[PDB]
């Protein structure tokens, strides 16, 4: 059938790179124009790109076989043998990491369920993502290390874990250390854009430790990713002409191009950011060629 989009408002949708509600919708020409995000990447025909998962609950999380130890001067240390978050084995292949693994840098605070030999508890570990580390992180190989400050051993029992993100320290929107400094297969940078076209950004704010809010953007809501993955539409042209309309009235707010590679462009020539209402909805108009010139906003 012809491609369509759900009439869900952005403000009601799920962010695709950090597990939080979508709070903003904007273009910002001062930001990097071709980000190489690995989550939130899908083709219109349903092909998942990078480490993009189907479920929003996988976003910026991981699962692993955990082996614990105490080391004076470091604290409780965890060696994680990564698995896919459904429990299936992670196989190094044509993606950077297990599905949903964080695609940004900084010091990530993660939470896992632990147990001792000495009831179940939730323990917070520190895990460095990147950009570069002295920990030899290699999620592409299925190997990551984490630690937490402690005066003595926590007497943790080894076992399977799910790690959810609690906060981030020193956030940088650059890809993490996927393979101990070596190259990895990556989803390409978002783009290209026509002259005057800029990326449409779905924005949330992540919990941070270092007072201004810490924004992080993604190309599509997670609901749009599962929508395309579930529908497996036939792609007929380079892009789809979309109109973003108010949900209650139908008033047109802007027109944009959803390229088949899974990113939305607007024609905007301003210098600073331009935020849009988050209570509208996108409707598919038609297929257009790549060179289709949008009305400026």
């Amino acid at each position: 059938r012809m491609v369509d989009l759900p009439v869900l408002q952005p403000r009601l949708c799920t962010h695709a790179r950090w597990p939080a509600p979508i709070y903003g919708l904007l273009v910002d020409p001062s930001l990097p124009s071709n980000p190489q995000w690995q989550n939130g990447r899908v083709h219109v025909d349903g092909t998942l790109l990078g480490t993009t998962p189907v479920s929003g609950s996988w976003v910026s999380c991981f699962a692993a076989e955990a082996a614990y130890e105490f080391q004076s001067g470091t604290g409780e240390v965890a060696t994680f043998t990564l698995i896919e978050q459904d429990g299936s084995a992670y196989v190094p292949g044509d993606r950077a990491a297990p599905l949903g693994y964080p695609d940004f840098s900084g010091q990530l605070e993660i939470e896992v369920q632990t147990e001792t030999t000495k009831k179940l508890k939730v323990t917070t570990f520190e895990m460095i993502l990147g950009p570069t580390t002295n920990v030899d992180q290699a999620p592409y190989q299925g190997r990551v290390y984490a630690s937490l400050t402690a005066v003595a051993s926590l007497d943790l029992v080894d076992g399977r874990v799910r790690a959810v993100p609690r906060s981030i320290y020193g956030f940088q929107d650059v890809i993490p250390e996927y393979n101990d400094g070596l190259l990895v297969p990556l989803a390409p940078p978002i783009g290209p854009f026509l002259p005057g076209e800029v990326l449409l950004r779905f924005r949330t704010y992540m919990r941070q430790l270092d007072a201004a809010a810490e924004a992080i953007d993604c190309a599509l809501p997670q609901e749009f990713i599962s929508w395309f993955a579930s529908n497996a539409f036939t792609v007929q042209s380079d892009a789809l002409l979309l109109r973003y309309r108010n949900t209650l009235t139908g008033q047109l707010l802007f027109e944009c191009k959803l390229y088949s590679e899974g990113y939305i462009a607007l024609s905007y020539s301003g210098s600073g950011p331009l935020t849009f209402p988050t209570d509208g909805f996108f409707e598919v108009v038609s297929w257009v060629p790549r060179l289709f010139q949008l009305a400026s906003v």
Partner: protein, 111 residues
Amino acid sequence: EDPVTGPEEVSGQEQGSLTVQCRYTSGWKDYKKYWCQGVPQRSCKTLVETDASEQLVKKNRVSIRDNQRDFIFTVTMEDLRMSDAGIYWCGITKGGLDPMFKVTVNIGPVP
């Protein structure tokens, strides 16, 4: 007992030098030693690093020399300026989490 230790706090002055003694246990003798700057701890910027020998290495205004008899590598920061103040780390390079020890560097003016 910790794998690598040193001074918790050091103070230096404009154009002066300071010396950081990073003591380590004997097992780390043939490992590369390094001097790291900043936070996050595990993504700090390595300023200078040995090749696991006793030969002195100098980069910019920082030098390092490993004494593999007494198990101490000595870091010298020279021509100090106010921008040098901050958090640094004695480091030993190994697979996974490195032995690291936090050294806070205070820099003041010359009276």
